[PDB]
């Protein structure tokens, strides 16, 4: 115990951890279906000083 106390002074925690190579997200991205919708020139009207 005396010997270990003497060398303990010269030590500090070696912050090492262990994880997985790949960690998937909790919720995988949902496949969004394609739906055709016409060009709309009003979608920016509420951004900044818009003009209706």
């Amino acid at each position: 115990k005396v010997a270990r106390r003497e060398i303990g002074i010269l030590t500090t925690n070696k912050n090492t951890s262990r994880t997985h190579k790949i960690i998937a997200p909790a919720n995988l991205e949902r496949p969004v279906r394609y739906i055709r919708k016409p060009i709309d020139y009003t979608i920016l009207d509420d951004i900044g000083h818009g003009v209706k």
Partner: protein, 62 residues
């Protein structure tokens, strides 16, 4: 005799060791500089046949 002398010597050493504290025990280099190294007994028996070792019975026959 020796047994009793040793037993009491063992008993109080068993107590001294209890009081040992690693947290406070400090080491000094004066043991290596100012204090002799431990030496175990080096007694060797010799001249086993001096007249003084002659058993009484044989002494009387002598």
């Amino acid at each position: 005799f020796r047994v009793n002398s040793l037993q009491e010597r063992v008993d109080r050493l068993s107590v001294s060791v209890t009081q040992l504290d690693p947290k406070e025990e400090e080491l000094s280099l004066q043991d290596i500089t100012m204090r002799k190294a431990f030496r175990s007994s080096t007694i060797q028996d010799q001249q086993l046949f001096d007249r003084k070792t002659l058993p009484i019975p044989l002494q009387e026959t002598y």
